[PDB]
Amino acid sequence: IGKSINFLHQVCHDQTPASKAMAVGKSAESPKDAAELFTDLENAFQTKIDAAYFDTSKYLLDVLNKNYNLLEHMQAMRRYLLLGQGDFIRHLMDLLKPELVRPATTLYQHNLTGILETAVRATNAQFDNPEILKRLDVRLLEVSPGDTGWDVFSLDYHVDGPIATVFTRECMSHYLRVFNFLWRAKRMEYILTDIWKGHMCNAKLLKGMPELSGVLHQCHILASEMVHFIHQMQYYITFEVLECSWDELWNKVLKAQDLDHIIAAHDVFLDTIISRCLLDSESRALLNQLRAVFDQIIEFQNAQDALYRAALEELQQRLQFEERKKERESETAAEEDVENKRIQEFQESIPKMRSQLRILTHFYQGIVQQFLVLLTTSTDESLRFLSFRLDFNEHY
Amino acid sequence: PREIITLQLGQCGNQIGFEFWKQLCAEHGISPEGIVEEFATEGTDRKDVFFYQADDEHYIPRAVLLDLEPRVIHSILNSPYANLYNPENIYLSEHGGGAGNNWASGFSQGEKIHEDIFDIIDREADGSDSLEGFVLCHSIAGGTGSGLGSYLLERLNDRYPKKLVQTYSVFPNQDEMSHVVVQPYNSLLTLKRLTQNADCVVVLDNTALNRIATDRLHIQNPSFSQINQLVSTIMSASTTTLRYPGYMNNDLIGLIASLIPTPRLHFLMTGYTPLTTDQSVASVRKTTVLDVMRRLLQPKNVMVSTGRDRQTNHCYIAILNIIQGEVDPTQVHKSLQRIRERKLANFIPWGPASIQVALSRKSPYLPSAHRVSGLMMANHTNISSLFERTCRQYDKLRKREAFLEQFRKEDIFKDNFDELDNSREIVQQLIDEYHA
């Protein structure tokens, strides 16, 4: 009670809790004690302070709803660092990609705020009413400019005043750790989106060559297997931790009656979800395979357009040379030579794609077998729930 | 951002898209001529993904409607939902067409109105600087939707190469062949364009419509006024991750990417159970999610005429199970727990399978926030039975000397009939080869 009574003095209120009747009671008690009840009332003194502890707590729960919206910001942070609603982040990550392919410079910060402010306007027509956009900024690291640029960008929930009593230094320092794996989970989801559209854009224009018919067909089968296995893994591991933790905190903050039980409900919340996402001291057997599948989908991606662009540009020279055959009649042996050179270059690129596919499906076969054994070695926590889900995905 | 342009075309494609836009106003809480409810922004968090973005809070539909027959559009302007449509985006008053009933009519009319057909439909393309793609809301029945729809599947493949193409096309009826007889010819000509000149389709059978239209709907005389009720709900059901705020596969290139195994194998089986209004009086007792997906894989809600004894040698590869509205998500992993024990889906022996389940909150409305809804997007390899049904009705007609002299007078000089036959058998052979 004595810790909560001091927290309602610096809340821009000097009001004794919810009434001026908390003065009345003290005066009554002091006269009663003065003439009556000389022996201490240790059985009854603990009763009406508990009938004081309950009223000072809910009034302190009432001053947030009028001025600051404390636990409304508990829900609002889940939409950005925990990525609850995807349309805020997908219309972000669409515009955010043409800046992340290039390495970061000293002129990297001034434009992302313009990219942020045009992304929050394109998805909203009523979100200008709350105070969320002023308490949410972009956080970058001190990494040297010789990187890939993708790992620098991250959003942070800012605090200034009475939002910073419930949010200490220890909370958002863990929220960047849970952001970087979840940003990389959506990074893999959108670069696989680009190569799936790369499957369907290139196959429509190379129609006319019978050799490249069966070339892309079996390669689309071996690409679809890395698509369907990543999808039923990555969609299910982050929706489940979303499920057991949204329904853990949000339903108990309005059933308990304290401000110190809000944080006591909160300080157990924000370290359960990151322990199921990425970070434990025993979870070194978790993030070693999820980074081994992370660079494998990069290696599968850059090799595709290294062999698609060979398979697609060399066809473009064949079709313009067909146009020169009708113009020479309206206006020979060397023309047949260069045709035989193109076919030899068509013949070169297909085993080069076959060799650069049969060695990467051997890597994926080695990843999918090592992904099982490393996730079955931890020290008797809720891994029986985690060892449950990955056997269900590969077989069913 | 994620703007899709719907290409409503044909005699049947215009009517199934007319109530598709009429369904969208009842769930967005908006009127076609005004905004009388405040439920449009607090309840629905995203509205500018199929509509055009607002200038006066008037969400214009991003729709174009061309047809040779003026009868389908003259039953539109007297309805009070046509003022939401614009008389300058597609046509003004008194628009017409051909005479006209031929596949070669609309196939030859595409290059004589070539200047005007690529002028006003491209004005909506540069409205958003990141276009999603094109959906051809056309028909296969008749020569109106099949004749002109095969032309735009070719010229939009190279002029817009980086855009998603995927159609909700309806299959024609094969009960008798008296009123129409040109049905095997115009269907297979468009079906070739749906596999190599198009990425994905969504099949909608006509003989499976009256299987459902007399199942629970209890009609005696089958009319055309019931064909828009099963179709318009599952169209808006397919964009619940896209219209309403979802997280995963919230784009149209999200859903189709996780189901297609390979090109020319894209024919997706559709299922949708809840269509009865007297179920409403017993959904007050917490009807759960544990019983709604046990009947999706059970062949009862399917809209595809397929064999019943041909499912033992065929295998599911991708199955989608979309729950909407009230889900009670603490037991949605419990519903997926019971899938492996029955093995109602035959799994491919060469690779893994996937049962993907997703959810999104529905409209703030009383028939929507109370009753559970299940949308199925299956992919089973028994779909060659329809391709065996259409091909056996195709080669039998060419031996009867039917429409070989009556069809090659206009713009057909060589026999392109076996060009459609081998490519259809290429689809039918690669389906059975796909499970090694």
Please answer yes or no on whether B347 and A123 come within 8 Å at the CB atom: no
Q: What are the CA-CA distances from residue B170 to residues B9, B138, B143, B376, B401 (Å)?
A: 12, 8, 14, 17, 28
CA-nearest residue of chain B to A388?
B337
The tokens describing B382, both together, are 């028994």
| B377 vs B365: CA distance, rounded Å | 25
Q: What are the CA-CA distances from residue B126 to residues A56, A98, A319, B48, B131 (Å)?
A: 59, 20, 30, 15, 8
Residues in A closer than 8 angstroms to B1, CB to CB, are 91, 94, 122-123
> Shortest CA distance to B8 belongs to which of B228, B162, B251?
B228
The answer to whether residues B375 and B238 touch, using CB atoms and an 8 Å cutoff, is yes
Q: Which of B55, B154, B247, B360 to mutate to test the interface with A (most CBs of A within 10 A)?
A: B247
The answer to whether residues B286 and B226 touch, using CB atoms and an 8 Å cutoff, is no
For A33, list phi and psi in degrees, rounded to 5: -65, -40
> Which of B1, B41, B161 comes nearest A91 by C-beta?
B1
Dihedral, A334, A335, A336, A338 alpha carbons, nearest 10? 90
Token match 């049905």: residue?
Answer: B183
The tokens describing B233, both together, are 């709900």
Q: Is A345 on the interface with B (CB under 8 A)?
A: no
Q: What are the CA-CA distances from residue B276 to residues A36, B205, B218, B291 (Å)?
A: 74, 21, 11, 17
> Shortest CA distance to B64 belongs to which of B150, B132, B152?
B152
**In terms of C-beta density within 10 A (0-12 exposed, 13-18 middle, 19 or more buried), how is residue B76 classed?**
middle
| A291 vs A181: CA distance, rounded Å | 10
Residues in B closer than 8 angstroms to A193, CB to CB, are 253-254, 257
The answer to whether residues A83 and A35 touch, using CB atoms and an 8 Å cutoff, is no
Token match 């969609």: residue?
Answer: A235
CA-nearest residue of chain A to B433?
A218
> Shortest CA distance to B94 belongs to which of B116, B78, B76, B74?
B74
Token match 């090659």: residue?
Answer: B408
For B73, list phi and psi in degrees, rounded to 5: -95, -20
Nearest-Cα distance to chain A for B304, in Å, is: 24
| A211 vs A206: CA distance, rounded Å | 11
| A383 vs A378: CA distance, rounded Å | 7
Q: Checking phi first, is residue B270 left (phi over 0); if not, alpha (psi -120 to 50) or beta? A: beta
> Which of B158, B250, B262 comes nearest A90 by C-beta?
B250
| B214 vs B14: CA distance, rounded Å | 24
Nearest-Cα distance to chain B for A146, in Å, is: 30
**In terms of C-beta density within 10 A (0-12 exposed, 13-18 middle, 19 or more buried), how is residue B364 classed?**
middle
Q: Which of A200, A369, A388 to mutate to test the interface with B (most CBs of B within 10 A)?
A: A200
| B436 vs B218: CA distance, rounded Å | 44
Q: What are the CA-CA distances from residue B417 to residues A113, A233, B139, B213, B315 (Å)?
A: 59, 45, 21, 35, 31
Helix axes B183-193, B417-433, angle to 10 degrees: 60
> Shortest CA distance to A205 belongs to which of B5, B201, B159, B192?
B159
CA-nearest residue of chain A to B160?
A201
The answer to whether residues B327 and B371 touch, using CB atoms and an 8 Å cutoff, is no
Q: Is A203 on the interface with B (CB under 8 A)?
A: yes
Task: List the resolution, Å.
Answer: 4.8
User: What radius of gyration, in Å, describes the C-alpha atoms of chain B?
Assistant: 22
The answer to whether residues B316 and B339 touch, using CB atoms and an 8 Å cutoff, is no
| A109 vs A139: CA distance, rounded Å | 10
Residues in B closer than 8 angstroms to A225, CB to CB, are 351-352
Q: What are the CA-CA distances from residue A135 to residues A81, A96, A304, B83, B384 (Å)?
A: 13, 20, 42, 43, 57
Q: Checking phi first, is residue A139 left (phi over 0); if not, alpha (psi -120 to 50) or beta? A: beta
The tokens describing B304, both together, are 């595809």
For B343, list phi and psi in degrees, rounded to 5: 50, 55
Q: What DSSP assignment string belongs to A324-369? A: HHHHHHH--HHHHHHHHHHHHHHHHHHHHHHHHHHTHHHHHHHHHH
A42 CB-near residues (< 8 Å, 6+ apart): none
Name the amino acid, one letter, at A316: Q
Q: Is A188 on the interface with B (CB under 8 A)?
A: no
Q: How many residues in total does chain B contain?
A: 436
CA-nearest residue of chain A to B360?
A85
> Shortest CA distance to B423 belongs to which of B188, B173, B110, B75?
B188
| A70 vs A7: CA distance, rounded Å | 14
Please answer yes or no on whether A126 and B130 come within 8 Å at the CB atom: no
Token match 């076969």: residue?
Answer: A365
Q: Which of A231, A364, A393 to mutate to test the interface with B (most CBs of B within 10 A)?
A: A231
CA-nearest residue of chain B to A393?
B354
Q: Is A282 on the interface with B (CB under 8 A)?
A: no
Q: After which residues is chain A broken (C to N over 2.5 A)?
A: 331
Half-sphere exposure of A212 (CA within 13 A, CB side): 22
| B63 vs B85: CA distance, rounded Å | 8
CA-nearest residue of chain A to B247?
A86
The answer to whether residues B145 and B11 touch, using CB atoms and an 8 Å cutoff, is yes
Q: Is A45 on the interface with B (CB under 8 A)?
A: no
Q: What DSSP assignment string belongs to A234-301? A: HHHHHHHHHHHHHHHHTTTTTTS--SHHHHHHHHHHTTTHHHHHT--SSGGGTTTTTTTTHHHHHHHH
Please answer yes or no on whether A86 and B254 come within 8 Å at the CB atom: no
The answer to whether residues A272 and A245 touch, using CB atoms and an 8 Å cutoff, is yes
The tokens describing A30, both together, are 């002091």
| A235 vs B117: CA distance, rounded Å | 42
* Strand-pair partners of B357: B321
Please answer yes or no on whether A126 and B248 come within 8 Å at the CB atom: no
The tokens describing A101, both together, are 């392919």
Omega within 30 of 0 (cis) for the link into B307: no
Going by DSSP bridges, is the β-strand pair A154-157/A136-139 parallel, antiparallel, or unpaired? Answer: antiparallel
The tokens describing A1, both together, are 């009670």
Q: Which residues of B95-125 are buried (b: 16+ CB within 10 A; e: fewer)?
A: eebbeeebbbbbbbbbeeeeeebeeebeebe
Dihedral, A97, A99, A101, A105 alpha carbons, nearest 10? -150
> Which of A200, A220, A240 comes nearest B333 by C-beta?
A240
Name the amino acid, one letter, at B79: S
DSSP A95: H
Write a three-state SS string for chain B.
CCEEEEEEECCCHHHHHHHHHHHHHHHHCCCCCCCCCCHHHHCCCCCCCCECCCCCCCCCECEEEECCCCHHHHCCCCCCCCCCCCCCCCCCCCCCCCCCCCHHHHHHHCCCCHHHHCCCCCCCCCCCCCEEEEECCCECCCCHHHHHHHHHHHHHHHHCCCCEEEEECECCCCCCCCCCCCHHHHHHHHHHHCCCCCCEEECCCCCCHHHHHCCCCCCCCCCHHHCCHHHHHHHHHHCHHHHCCCCCCCCHHHHHHHCCCECCECEEEEEECCCCHHHHHHHHHCCCCCCCCCCCCCCCCECCCCCCCCCCCCCEEEEEEEEECCCCCCCHHHHHHCHHHHCCCCECCCCCCEEEEEEECCCCCCCCCCCCEEEEEEEECCCHHHHHHHHHHHHHHHCCCCCCCCCCCCCCCCCCHHHHHHHHHHHHHHHHHCCC
Half-sphere exposure of B226 (CA within 13 A, CB side): 17
Q: Checking phi first, is residue B211 left (phi over 0); if not, alpha (psi -120 to 50) or beta? A: alpha
Residues in A closer than 8 angstroms to B260, CB to CB, are 224
> Which of A123, A205, A396 comes nearest B355 by C-beta?
A396
Q: How many residues in total does chain A contain?
A: 396
The tokens describing A189, both together, are 């989801």
Opening angle at CA B379, ends B376 and B385, nearest 5:
115
Is A138 strand, coil or helix? strand
Dihedral, B428, B429, B430, B433 alpha carbons, nearest 10? 130
**In terms of C-beta density within 10 A (0-12 exposed, 13-18 middle, 19 or more buried), how is residue B40 classed?**
buried
> Which of B42, B247, B258 comes nearest A231 by C-beta?
B258
Distance of CA B141 to the CA centre of its chain: 14
CA-nearest residue of chain B to A230?
B258
The answer to whether residues B64 and B7 touch, using CB atoms and an 8 Å cutoff, is yes
Alpha helices in chain A (DSSP H): 2-7, 21-35, 45-48, 50-67, 70-76, 87-100, 109-122, 169-205, 211-249, 260-269, 273-277, 294-330, 333-358, 360-373, 386-395
DSSP A86: T
User: What radius of gyration, in Å, describes the C-alpha atoms of chain A?
Assistant: 31
| B68 vs B153: CA distance, rounded Å | 18
The answer to whether residues B354 and A228 touch, using CB atoms and an 8 Å cutoff, is yes
The tokens describing B71, both together, are 């009868």
The answer to whether residues B426 and B264 touch, using CB atoms and an 8 Å cutoff, is yes
Q: Which helix (H) or strand (E) holds A137?
A: strand A136-139
| B88 vs B83: CA distance, rounded Å | 12
The answer to whether residues B296 and B336 touch, using CB atoms and an 8 Å cutoff, is no
Dihedral, B47, B48, B49, B53 alpha carbons, nearest 10? 150
Going by DSSP bridges, is the β-strand pair B267-272/B373-380 parallel, antiparallel, or unpaired? Answer: antiparallel
Maximum Cα–Cα distance for chain B, whole Å? Answer: 67
Q: Which of A128, A209, A228 to mutate to test the interface with B (most CBs of B within 10 A)?
A: A228
Name the amino acid, one letter, at A294: F
> Which of A86, A228, A231 comes nearest B246 by C-beta?
A86
> Which of B263, B329, B351 comes nearest A225 by C-beta?
B351
Nearest-Cα distance to chain A for B374, in Å, is: 19
